[PDB]
């Protein structure tokens, strides 16, 4: 039960923002910007690939992702290097994996270039999904009041 007041959220997402330990399941190209079914089908496909590679002794890449006013950033855990950066305005839909409480994904990109990024969180995925919800709503609210710049 975390405090989700505006002032708290602002401090939470400013700068580097919130960091979470996880593993990259994969990135899939999808035909639309949103859709529960669209994301679940994509998640199932990406996991299918992961399972096939695991049978061959492969493992998912260890990463840490951050949620900040800069959107979602994925860093390689071993080196700390930024590998993927999806700005808030490029993220169109967030979806939890109804078959896995430790996985979620998001659709990013403009029209004609939608991609579903699938993540396997170290801990439960819920707090991450909720941070994204709070981040987006906060940015919407600040922009409406025209105070985004004064807070980011």
């Amino acid at each position: 039960g975390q405090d989700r007041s505006e002032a708290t959220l602002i401090k939470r997402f400013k700068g580097e923002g919130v960091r979470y330990k996880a593993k990259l399941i994969g990135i899939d190209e999808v035909s639309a910007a949103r859709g529960d079914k669209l994301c679940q089908d994509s998640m199932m496909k990406l996991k299918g690939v992961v399972a096939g590679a695991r049978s061959k002794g492969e493992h998912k890449q260890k990463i840490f992702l951050t949620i900040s006013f800069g959107g979602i950033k994925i860093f390689d855990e071993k080196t700390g290097a930024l590998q993927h950066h999806h700005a808030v305005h490029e993220i169109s839909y967030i979806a939890k994996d109804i078959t896995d409480h430790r996985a979620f994904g998001y659709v990013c990109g403009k029209e004609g270039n939608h991609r579903f990024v699938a993540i396997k969180t170290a801990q439960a995925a819920e707090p991450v999904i909720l941070d994204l919800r709070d981040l987006f709503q906060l940015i919407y609210e600040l922009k409406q009041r025209e105070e985004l710049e004064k807070k980011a």
Binding site: D36, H89, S92, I94, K110, E111, F136, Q137
Partner: peptide
């Protein structure tokens, strides 16, 4: 599951 209110389809 939710849509991002500040997404720009452009």
């Amino acid at each position: 599951n939710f849509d991002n209110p500040v997404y720009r389809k452009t």
